[PDB]
């Protein structure tokens, strides 16, 4: 599986079956963007994990 | 002072002298974007530091 | 005023009037800790801010 | 497998074969701590992944 990872495309390790993209905002002044290969998502984030090449732009 | 802060304008606290925009990248998969008011700021350590209203878009 | 900043004690600049400790947990595995001197400590609750020297843990 | 995850002990999904603990520090005031169940580590982080219950405490 290949995933976007901030302007690189990367091949996931064998045990990482998902691509992931999500954006968080822990503090008023801070936005963070997590994007890459991943393991399975929590129940609450199932839509953030996808399992086809480059699915996580 | 008023500053941009992630798609909105905020009024800084009365003693804060700068607006800023900054980013970090601690890991290959994780980007951080910081934007708002600050009390101190060195332009060389930010994308931008300025001291007029809304200067940090 | 003096505050903790991640196992350093810092002396606040004159425009940084409280000590601050906030944490965020945007994703299940990722914790962010923001700690130091602040004037963004401008609610009137001792939620993220505390007033007394070295109060912020 | 069970792992610590920021003051919780959690049971990993079947596709997560490791417990993980790591940190980053992009700014003097901001610490990041990654802790939980994980997939395999990169080569540079081999010591950050372990395979026994609660090993990333």
Swiss-Prot record, chains A, B, C, D:
UniProt site (Important residue for inhibition of rat ASIC1a): 27-28, 33-34
Variant or mutagenesis effect after changing residue 32 to A: 2200-fold decrease in inhibitory potency of ASIC1a
Main location: secreted
Tissue: Expressed by the venom gland.
Impact when changing residue 5 to A: Small increase in inhibitory potency on cASIC1a
Impact after mutating residue 30 to A: 5.1-fold decrease in inhibitory potency of ASIC1a
Domain of life, source organism: Eukaryota
Recorded consequence of changing residue 57 to A: 1.5-fold decrease in inhibitory potency of ASIC1a
Annotated compartments: Secreted
GO molecular function per UniProt: ion channel regulator activity; toxin activity
Effect of residue 6 to A: Important decrease in inhibitory potency on cASIC1a
Record keywords: Disulfide bond, Ion channel impairing toxin, Pharmaceutical, Proton-gated sodium channel impairing toxin, Secreted, Signal, Toxin
Mutation effect (residue 31 to A): 4.9-fold decrease in inhibitory potency of ASIC1a
Annotated phenotype, changing residue 8 to A: No change in inhibitory potency on cASIC1a
Family: Belongs to the three-finger toxin family. Short-chain subfamily. Mambalgin sub-subfamily.
Biological role stated in the UniProt entry: This three-finger toxin inhibits ASIC channels. It acts as a gating modifier toxin by decreasing the apparent proton sensitivity of activation and by slightly increasing the apparent proton sensitivity for inactivation. It binds more tightly to the closed state and to a much lesser extent the inactivated/desensitized state of ASIC1a isoform of ASIC1. It interacts directly with the outside surface of the thumb domain of chicken ASIC1a (ASIC1a), but does not insert into the acidic pocket as suggested for mambalgin-2.
Other noteworthy facts: Negative results: has no effect on rat ASIC2a, rat ASIC3, rat ASIC1a-ASIC3 and rat ASIC1b-ASIC3 channels, as well as on TRPV1, P2RX2 (P2X2), HTR3A (5-HT3A), Nav1.8 (SCN10A), Cav3.2 (CACNA1H) and Kv1.2 (KCNA2) channels. Does not produce motor dysfunction, apathy, flaccid paralysis, convulsions or death upon central injections (intrathecal or intracerebroventricular) in mice.
Protein name per Swiss-Prot or TrEMBL: Mambalgin-1
Residues of the full protein shown: 22 to 78 of 78
